[PDB]
């Protein structure tokens, strides 16, 4: 499912970041970086959910996971 992040999506993300020209090897590296970041955040969120004895990962769990990694996110509680 990592291939679901298509080349145009990565290009759009780079354009929002001000990138004008993109090498062909950027896409695999970006997919790997995104996978690592999501793995860390999701692992923390699942740990929070398991501590709560819940079976549904809530937005608050993701917010706490992000805040633990110094990535506080507003707009979700």
């Amino acid at each position: 499912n990592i291939q679901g992040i298509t080349k145009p999506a990565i290009r759009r993300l780079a354009r929002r970041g001000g990138v004008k020209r993109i090498s062909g090897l950027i896409y695999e590296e970006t997919r790997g970086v995104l996978k690592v970041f999501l793995e860390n955040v999701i692992r923390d969120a699942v740990t929070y959910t398991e501590h709560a004895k819940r079976k549904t990962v809530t937005a608050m769990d993701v917010v706490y996971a992000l805040k633990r990694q110094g990535r506080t996110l507003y707009g979700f509680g």
Binding site: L13, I42, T49, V62, R71
Partner: protein
């Protein structure tokens, strides 16, 4: 009619810096989140707001990383981002 190689890139940069909507499709990102979470716990359920927050955080992180990568590429007298630029940005940040 054909625009020169870089006019459309600048146009897209302006368009996507004006805009604020998410740039990754919702369903593929949700499927990736579920696939990643499968390795941590089985039969997991996700709220829609949780997946939206994950998508927002991931896109913000990727945009910041691409900004740093563009800065690295400019530092090397280039206008094209390369994987070594991403690796250098992540190494200076303290992630690898």
């Amino acid at each position: 009619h054909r625009y020169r190689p870089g006019t459309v890139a600048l146009r897209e940069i302006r368009r996507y810096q004006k805009s604020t909507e998410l740039l990754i499709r919702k369903l593929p990102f949700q499927r990736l989140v579920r696939e990643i979470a499968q390795d941590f716990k089985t039969d997991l359920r996700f709220q829609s707001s949780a997946v939206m927050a994950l998508q927002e955080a991931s896109e913000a992180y990727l945009v910041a990383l691409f900004e740093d990568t563009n800065l690295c590429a400019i530092h090397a007298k280039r206008v094209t981002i390369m994987p070594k630029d991403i690796q250098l940005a992540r190494r200076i940040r303290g992630e690898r």
